[PDB]
Write a protein that binds this DNA or RNA. Structure first.
Length: 66
DNA sequence: TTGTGTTTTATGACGTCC
DNA sequence: GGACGTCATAAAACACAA
């Protein structure tokens, strides 16, 4: 049992650089990237799902209004 | 330190789509 | 179908005032 794993900065770099392109992932690029960053398509799926919840959580607060 | 507060992987529940 | 989307949540991993 291994609950979690941290991702190399290079994996986090590329992953993040795609989020900038689209907050959503084509099954092509899901798999195209999965392979070039050596990670399960299911992973690149959840990372993008999670990444959005961050932008959502930042953006909510960036509504400081005050 | 350290303890405590936030950030990063990850899963299951349930929902939407022609 | 059957792929993905949101979630509430858990726990490893990290950051950093006292």
């Amino acid at each position: 049992d291994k609950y979690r794993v941290v991702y190399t900065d290079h994996q986090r770099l590329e992953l993040e650089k795609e989020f900038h392109y689209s907050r959503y992932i084509t099954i092509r690029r899901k798999a195209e990237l999965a392979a070039t960053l050596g990670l399960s398509e299911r992973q690149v799926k959840i990372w993008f799902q999670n990444r959005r919840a961050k932008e959502r959580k930042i953006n909510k607060k960036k509504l400081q209004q005050q």
